[PDB]
Amino acid sequence: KGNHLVKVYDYQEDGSVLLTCDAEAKNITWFKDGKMIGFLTEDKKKWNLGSNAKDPRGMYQCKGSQNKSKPLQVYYRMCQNCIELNAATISGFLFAEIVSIFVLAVGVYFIAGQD
Amino acid sequence: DTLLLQLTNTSAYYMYLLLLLKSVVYFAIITCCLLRRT
Amino acid sequence: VHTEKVNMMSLTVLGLRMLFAKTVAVNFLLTAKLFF
């Protein structure tokens, strides 16, 4: 085993990542970056972090009566704020930029001329 | 194919947000001058 | 694939279109007065 009790079991249909601790004990307390931000587990052991779109990170320990578990890295790059910088997108972005500046420049030239 | 929709959609979100700031900037230039005139 | 967030990503884009059109309209109106 190697004392790597912490495991992850997620399901695709319901978007959420869940921490399952392979500890045969009750009132297991959780951790994050070596600090206690984990409630003691009664009945259901599956810790909840949230949705995968939130991109959870950090160390997650699992401490019970028997010392504590080994850390597990959770790294999520679930692209929510990712854009595609393909050929079309750069051209469209620059074109929108240029038309905006062109219109604003025409308006500013007119105000400068009048006032 | 659904992913491509997400990419173009968020790119659109940023682009229109930028256009909104440009609108606010032009708004500021116009309001300063129109308040100075009147 | 989570299409679920994509719907309100599109909805927020549409709200941005609301605000972009309205801002264009108000800037146009102010310019029209200033020239008149």
């Binding site: 074109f95 038309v99 219109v103 | 173009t8 | -």
Partner: peptide
């Protein structure tokens, strides 16, 4: 492409609207 087509023609139609409204303001009043 279809959303990009939408956005492109929105840009074109916006520029058309501003141009023609400018001309109308020049013309009628």
């Amino acid at each position: 492409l279809d959303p990009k087509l939408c956005y492109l023609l929105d840009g074109i139609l916006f520029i058309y609207g501003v141009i023609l409204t400018a001309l109308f303001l020049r013309v009628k009043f």
